[PDB]
């Protein structure tokens, strides 16, 4: 149940990195399907920190994206990787 959070790459305040992890934790408690997890996190960050955020949630992917400075995080919640970033 209690998945270990492990931050792999962050360009954001330590405040928001804790918010990300906590918000992803709530999303994984509520939803099982990766697109629904990603939607919950994206929509919460659009609210809590203003648009436009994007979120990818998965067990196997690589990515290359462009993000505003101080608005990028990539972390594992258990065995699930979460990419969350602002662009636009």
């Amino acid at each position: 149940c209690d998945r270990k959070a492990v931050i792999k790459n962050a360009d954001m305040s330590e405040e928001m990195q804790q918010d990300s992890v906590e918000c992803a934790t709530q999303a994984l408690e509520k939803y099982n399907i990766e697109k629904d997890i990603a939607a919950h996190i994206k929509k919460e960050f659009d609210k809590k920190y203003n648009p436009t955020w994007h979120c990818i949630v998965g067990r196997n992917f690589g990515s290359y994206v462009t993000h505003e400075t101080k608005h990028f995080i990539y972390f594992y919640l258990g065995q699930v990787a979460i990419l969350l970033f602002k662009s636009g």
Binding site: G58, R59, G62, S63, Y64, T66, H67, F85
Partner: peptide, 10 residues
């Protein structure tokens, strides 16, 4: 002010 980033899963 923007930056490019890679990610990759284990």
């Amino acid at each position: 002010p923007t930056k490019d980033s890679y990610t990759l899963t284990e």
